[PDB]
């Protein structure tokens, strides 16, 4: 039956080895381009075309999101996301006033050497302190001035690890979208598109401009199933049955 | 006479093996661009064109509908749509309140392993139960919390399969438009454009962007008829006859 | 957890040899594109795609600041920014009146020859004067005219030098952003994207158009760590733990 | 320190042979783009990178002034602008009326043959007369008509010549801008960008469209100093010192 | 508690650098309008709103008097009014 | 002091090349409005304003009399009014 398709689709994933349902999405795009290389035989009096050669089928996919998830990047590389790992991260503090005795006091727990910046761009890389306070050379600064410090702090959280020898694994995909009946302003069928064997392609650019909202982007490529030789499948299901 | 043509066409298709009138339409575009190769033999004292030889003749097509119809995409891939076939698709259940004994109950008929989701983004996959009651570990969640579930079901509906070896077949096509008389502001003649041998080309894309109406596009390429060497025919017929 | 990212990142830098924390920033762009090569092995009774060969792996970078700091240019070459070095720069003084005796008095300290410009576009390059008062040719101008002069001067400042041989060294970088909670409009995570080993790339342009704000751009190239084989690392630290 | 640059630059030029400070501008653009060539060696189990071959250092400038001065063109050919040179140029007189005796009289001083044009657009070529009174064929015009005249006159001025062999010499260049302090809203530093050796590149174009304020454009190509192997030098002199 | 405002606003000023208490008046209007932006991210089956991006919080003031005073104008251009100057 | 201006302002005009006091008036309206613009560089974690650029200062004038004159139009085009000319 003729139907009108309006909305985008919900995207699922699944790794063939263990069965990790890697996502339930709320997306902005879904695409399943095709491509076949076609030539044309020719012969006879008058260079007539008599047949069209067709050989080399491909299918590409593309999905695009409006939030950020870390499983997203996890798929493209084949790693696993460790949980609760100690890590090192930089941190900064501002507005540190120097007392009259030429001394200042941090308020954190540095792990590496702390560097100090004045209001002209000079630098001082003093070694980590044991008690909490530091002494300032007179040349760098004087009393009743301001300084800023940068040092490394240890925080706990999740961690991925992009590695240069490992590459992606094999996945399953499926979209789901609705189509209305152009006579009755009702919903009629639930369109699905399954892909039984697909290999993620590593090409992603996370530009992080000012005031914009980042939209990820995964791209796949579909390979032929070895059992029944099916690259893509389309299903329609009536809501009246 | 001189006339002004202003609208699109009604497109008909017809397969040559079984004779299936695969479509009537209400479309948005139609085209049959043509192309030829020229060479300009030169020779003799002074560079002079002696003769211009024509060597090829290509006819393309294009059609663009405003409604989704499964037989369109069925044409370009050879396959014949199967009816009333059992399939496996994903389904999702939201907002489940945990009981006091760390147990939850579903409302469906899972046919694969069930996967649960935490409010923070964990995962826990457990085999299907017979009574529909699943026990959740204490660390995953406690009482008075909300989880979500994902699983597969069995549905009945239509089905296609884009195979990597089976390619299309050969059809007939025909358009039809309406031509006006530029004096009396009336309809004068009906235009027709027939093609007696056509081979659909597999190059199509279905983007499913949010808030955009899907516009299928199906390209063709025509080939010379063996009986009488006609790639196309144009007919004009007045409504006064 | 799904989260939404809006703002840019704070970029940090550090030279692996010395330990000079080259930069804290207030940025406008940040990206870490990837690249991989695919091959499409084929063969069969059609052209069945059997396996994807995946070779090569590169990660680039770019940061686009909103202020100008000389350390940005320091990174792009590797040379150190010398401090308090004397240098020679030009200076011009307008509105020079000719006295009745056909002489002029400068108001500076020339270190080389003085070239004067009259109101028509003539030139006259006198040797540097000792007394400071110059004598203008009678043909160049007359009493009660206006001239312009240009000469060199000695100043003190910082200095960089782009040589044609020296090449870059290796750095460490970190991004940091804030991702929000889509249910409560609070802050949930603090993203980190480390880059344990990077190599500055020589490609940079400084357009100084009229009536514009200048935004430098630096582009890097990421190389695998020699110990661990980790090109880049992503870290998601919750603000609850 | 951190600073914000707003304005364009003042450029200074200088010939290394005779020492003529060839300019002092008020510009609309500037640029000092850079370039490097990179190729990657590969080998081993896994097509891994082992070495990078960095094999150039090219710099180019570009300036776009807001007035027109002939010295700009002088720079791009190396010639010298001669002063007070006799030249021959065309001149056009309109609105001549034919007397009742079939004669017309000019009001200038030709040096070549004079060509007349009539209201239909014919032509009549006559030699230069000694008394200045000329005769018109009766077919060309009659009494009380309107004619126009075009011919050559001798004028004096400045002269330049683009030849087919002469090529450029080597030059010095310098920019200069002003950078503000983002806290107390005042100018802090004075950026400089020196270039110790350049060579003008001949690619210039003067489109003289109607109603556009012409803007010349000059391109250079920086080379390496023989003495110190420096291609560029950057300075920041603070007004507090 | 609940109240009714009927009278105008008496206004005050001050400079941050030298601190001249420039201002008093019996004024006629006063307002401090605010303005914030929105973008309304969307997505999903049905193009629903999911999150609202806010990227500004700006306020601007306005005051009008009934008697002209020079210090008002001086404040805009920042000039320090000279006194006892010979003029033509 | 605080003052209350009730009347308009008498106008004077003068060319700078020759120095003709081109006009005098009892007019009805006058004004000397001004105009500037803003650009507000932005950036950072939270798109805050980092610096304000000032790049304009343009002043326009308007004057409106109740009586007509030809010198009035004369300044506008710069043409000198010839006298005692035979006209059709």
Automatic annotation (TrEMBL), chains A, B, C, D:
<protein>
    <submittedName>
        <fullName>Uncharacterized protein</fullName>
    </submittedName>
</protein>
């Amino acid at each position: 039956m003729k139907t009108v398709i309006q909305d985008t689709a919900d995207v699922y994933f699944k790794r063939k080895s263990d069965g990790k349902l890697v996502f339930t999405a709320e997306a902005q795009t879904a695409s399943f381009s095709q491509a076949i290389s076609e030539e044309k035989l020719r012969g006879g009096i008058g260079n007539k075309p008599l047949y069209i050669l067709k050989s080399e089928k491909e299918i590409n996919l593309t999905v695009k999101n409006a939030f950020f998830d870390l499983e997203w990047l996890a798929m493209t590389q084949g790693e696993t996301i460790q949980e609760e790992t100690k890590v090192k991260v930089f941190d900064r503090e501002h507005g540190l006033i120097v007392d009259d005795t030429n001394k200042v006091t941090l308020k954190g727990k540095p792990v590496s050497d702390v560097t100090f910046y004045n209001k002209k761009g000079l630098t001082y890389k003093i070694a980590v302190s044991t008690d909490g306070t530091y002494t300032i050379p007179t040349a760098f600064a004087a009393a009743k001035d301001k300084l800023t410090a940068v040092y490394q702090i240890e925080k706990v959280g999740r961690r991925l690890a992009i590695k240069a020898s490992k590459f992606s694994e094999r996945y399953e995909v499926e979209y789901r979208t609705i189509a209305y009946n152009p006579d009755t302003e009702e919903v009629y069928s639930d369109i699905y598109i399954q892909f039984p064997n697909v290999s993620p392609s590593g090409e992603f650019e996370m530009s992080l401009e000012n005031g914009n909202a980042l939209a990820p982007e995964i791209k796949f490529e579909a390979l032929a199933d070895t059992d029944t030789d099916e690259m893509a499948v389309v299903i329609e299901a009536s809501r009246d049955e």
